[PDB]
Amino acid sequence: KQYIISEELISEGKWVKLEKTTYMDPTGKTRTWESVKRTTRKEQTADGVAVIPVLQRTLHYECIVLVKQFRPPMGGYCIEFPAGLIDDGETPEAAALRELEEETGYKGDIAECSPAVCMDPGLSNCTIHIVTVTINGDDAENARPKPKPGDGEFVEVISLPKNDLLQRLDALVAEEHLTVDARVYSYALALKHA
Amino acid sequence: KQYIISEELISEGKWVKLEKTTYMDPTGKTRTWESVKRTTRKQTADGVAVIPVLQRTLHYECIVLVKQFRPPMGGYCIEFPAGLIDDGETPEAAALRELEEETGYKGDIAECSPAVCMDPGLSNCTIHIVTVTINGDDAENARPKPKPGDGEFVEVISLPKNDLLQRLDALVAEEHLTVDARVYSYALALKHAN
Ligand SMILES: [Cl-]
Numbered sequence: 296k297q298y299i300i301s302e303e304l305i306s307e308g309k310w311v312k313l314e315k316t317t318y319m320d321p322t323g324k325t326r327t328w329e330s331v332k333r334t335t336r337k338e339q340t341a342d343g344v345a346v347i348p349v350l351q352r353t354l355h356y357e358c359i360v361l362v363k364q365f366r367p368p369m370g371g372y373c374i375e376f377p378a379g380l381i382d383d384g385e386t387p388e389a390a391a392l393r394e395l396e397e398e399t400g401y402k403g404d405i406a407e408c409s410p411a412v413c414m415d416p417g418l419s420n421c422t423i424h425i426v427t428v429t430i431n432g433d434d435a436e437n438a439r440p441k442p443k444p445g446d447g448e449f450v451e452v453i454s455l456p457k458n459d460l461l462q463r464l465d466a467l468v469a470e471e472h473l474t475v476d477a478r479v480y481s482y483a484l485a486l487k488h489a
Numbered sequence: 490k491q492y493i494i495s496e497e498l499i500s501e502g503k504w505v506k507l508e509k510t511t512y513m514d515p516t517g518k519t520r521t522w523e524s525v526k527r528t529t530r531k532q533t534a535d536g537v538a539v540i541p542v543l544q545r546t547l548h549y550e551c552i553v554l555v556k557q558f559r560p561p562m563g564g565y566c567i568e569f570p571a572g573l574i575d576d577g578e579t580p581e582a583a584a585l586r587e588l589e590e591e592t593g594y595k596g597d598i599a600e601c602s603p604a605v606c607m608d609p610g611l612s613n614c615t616i617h618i619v620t621v622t623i624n625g626d627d628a629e630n631a632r633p634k635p636k637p638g639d640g641e642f643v644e645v646i647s648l649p650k651n652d653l654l655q656r657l658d659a660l661v662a663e664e665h666l667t668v669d670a671r672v673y674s675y676a677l678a679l680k681h682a683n
């Protein structure tokens with residue numbers, strides 16, 4: 296029923312643009328919307344990937360590996376799933392494993408990969424694949440993992456037990472002035488609601 | 490260690506602005522970032538998203554979701570009921586109001602998150618995620634009628650909690666819709682909790 300009529304540029308940057316979107320509502324009335332888009336998207340299925348990294352070790356509870364970084368748009372520190380943009384020609388799966396190794400040092404194995412999902416659809420067209428990855432923490436390659444961050448990336452790794460994720464995240468927030476990512480919190484809520 | 494040095498406006502709109510953020514990295518090097526902000530914040534957060542658990546005796550619990558055309562995405566999206574918090578409104582009151590508006594259901598607050606980030610590599614947008622139970626056997630929830638505001642066109646989709654991820658994957662396979670990343674994260678964790 297509803298569809299895009301046109302997209303007028305309002306302002307471009309090196310990395311992000313703002314657009315005035317004209318669209319047809321279900322009554323036949325024309326309406327407008329201010330939309331944000333990244334400038335970097337190619338023939339990728341999505342802008343980025345987020346990795347759900349499940350650290351598995353014998354005689355240990357499973358952990359979910361997360362990353363803490365300063366995020367300039369937020370003006371503060373955020374706790375997130377390891378994540379980044381998909382390179383031109385890279386598969387979501389390869390980007391997931393690469394970004395996980397870069398940001399955390401862990402070498403994972405693909406478990407599953409989502410279709411493209413929207414980050415904030417009332418505001419942007421940004422999409423990711425959410426890729427679930429198991430990390431064999433008993434393999435020697437994952438013994439003392441060293442991050443290989445790229446230029447301008449500064450990451451601290453935080454691994455929290457899956458069986459208590461939400462309480463552990465609430466404790467971090469109580470002690471240390473930082474924001475939890477909405478996908479991380481949604482995941483933690485569902486672990487409790489199950 | 491890291492902090493904001495300055496924020497240059499690049500373009501404002503009625504609802505969204507684009508900013509060049511200058512910040513200090515942990516090595517003492519000055520760097521820049523293109524950031525998006527909403528112009529509407531007054532509030533603990535921009536918005537709320539509601540996790541509505543429809544509970545009816547002798548039925549599977551359902552998660553109530555909404556399908557809407559999203560102009561930034563150029564297509565239809567499946568999301569938790571959600572909207573912006575009004576000036577002076579508590580997150581909890583906004584959650585119950587937006588849930589009744591978008592779905593017709595009258596719920597009860599179960600829990601409320603701290604402010605969580607939507608896409609911290611890109612914007613400063615935040616929400617409270619509010620978990621709400623809906624007593625589907627109460628007569629008030631028998632024949633619920635949405636009361637959408639101006640420009641809101643919502644289809645309500647209830648899916649069983651015990652099979653949410655498979656049900657969402659099936660919708661995506663049959664219908665060309667995008668699932669919201671928080672919805673998908675929640676659905677994954679329902680499966681991963683085993
Ligand atoms: Cl619940």
Ligand SMILES: [Mg+2]
Binds near residue numbers: 377
């Ligand atoms: Mg990253």
Ligand SMILES: [Mg+2]
Binds near residue numbers: 378379394397398448
């Ligand atoms: Mg990275």
Ligand SMILES: [Mg+2]
Binds near residue numbers: 571573591
């Ligand atoms: Mg609304």
Ligand SMILES: [Mg+2]
Binds near residue numbers: 570571572591
């Ligand atoms: Mg809404």
